[PDB]
Amino acid sequence: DKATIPSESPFAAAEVADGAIVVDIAKMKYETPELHVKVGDTVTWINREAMPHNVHFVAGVLGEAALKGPMMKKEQAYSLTFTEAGTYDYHCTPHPFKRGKVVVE
Ligand SMILES: [Zn+2]
Ligand SMILES: [Zn+2]
């Protein structure tokens, strides 16, 4: 598997480290729809809207099974640590037309 999960459930945005790699979730888009990180980096998504959103990697992308992230409320965060190089597309489960990617290099 190509990513590990530091926290199975969403956590408070106030707990995200200074300097962290962050993708804000907005209504109309993940604010960084194509993010490049280094192998071993942790990416943190933070929901900035009241509408719940998540991140969802379909089966085959981070491994054999899908990785459907938990639904995040406003000012909640969720992190993934990417352990192999590759390009990993994801989307928001309830709003599947909103999509992003992480390029790990
Ligand atoms: Zn790059
Ligand atoms: Zn959404």
UniProtKB/Swiss-Prot annotation:
Plastocyanin-like domain segment(s): 1-105
Chief subcellular location: periplasm
Cofactors (names): Cu cation
Binding annotation for Cu cation: 53, 92, 95, 98
Location of the protein in the cell: Periplasm
Record-level Gene Ontology MF annotations: copper ion binding; electron transfer activity
Entry keywords, A to Z: Copper, Electron transport, Metal-binding, Periplasm, Signal, Transport
Associated pathway: One-carbon metabolism; methylamine degradation
GO cellular component assignments: periplasmic space
Parts of the chain that traverse the membrane: none
Cofactor binding comment, as recorded: Binds 1 copper ion per subunit.
Disulfide bridge positions per record: none
Summary of the function given for this chain in its UniProt record: Primary acceptor of electrons from methylamine dehydrogenase. Passes those electrons on either a soluble cytochrome c or to pseudoazurin.
The name this protein goes by in its record: Amicyanin
Species lineage: Bacteria, Pseudomonadati, Pseudomonadota, Alphaproteobacteria, Rhodobacterales
